Amino acid sequence: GPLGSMSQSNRELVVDFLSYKLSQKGYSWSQMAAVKQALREAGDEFELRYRRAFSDLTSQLHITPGTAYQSFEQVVNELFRDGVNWGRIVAFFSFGGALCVESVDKEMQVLVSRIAAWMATYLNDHLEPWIQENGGWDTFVELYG
């Protein structure tokens, strides 16, 4: 309901802000918060270090709504064709972000929620088995956090 939603929204705002302030001091609200923060930083670092190459590949992105799924799946399949590792996983997230930004740039905002769903499905079905076999997201935090 509207009343509860208002209450729930205020709570989430508080949690979000506190999580952020804690992270700035190297603390975390929760393990989930720690993972989110590690992934954000790793994505930033990835995109910063390899700025030339990342801009290059994203400049090759010429998506239309009718070709975006094929573009997403074909890149991601090739990315993981001969293995999964933490760096390729960071690359997978960064690629998804780039696609969302490009979609909004070109007034294709409708693609944003679709890309998120495609990424979540891929993560669930194709990355999670490796992730669980390799120490889970807690292990990623230990390495890239």
Partner: peptide, 18 residues
């Protein structure tokens, strides 16, 4: 092409940390 370049930098990033 995109995926090749993405894969290359992903592996570089991986090699550094993991």
């Amino acid at each position: 092409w995109i995926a090749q370049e993405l894969r290359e930098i992903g592996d570089k990033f991986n090699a550094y940390y993991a």
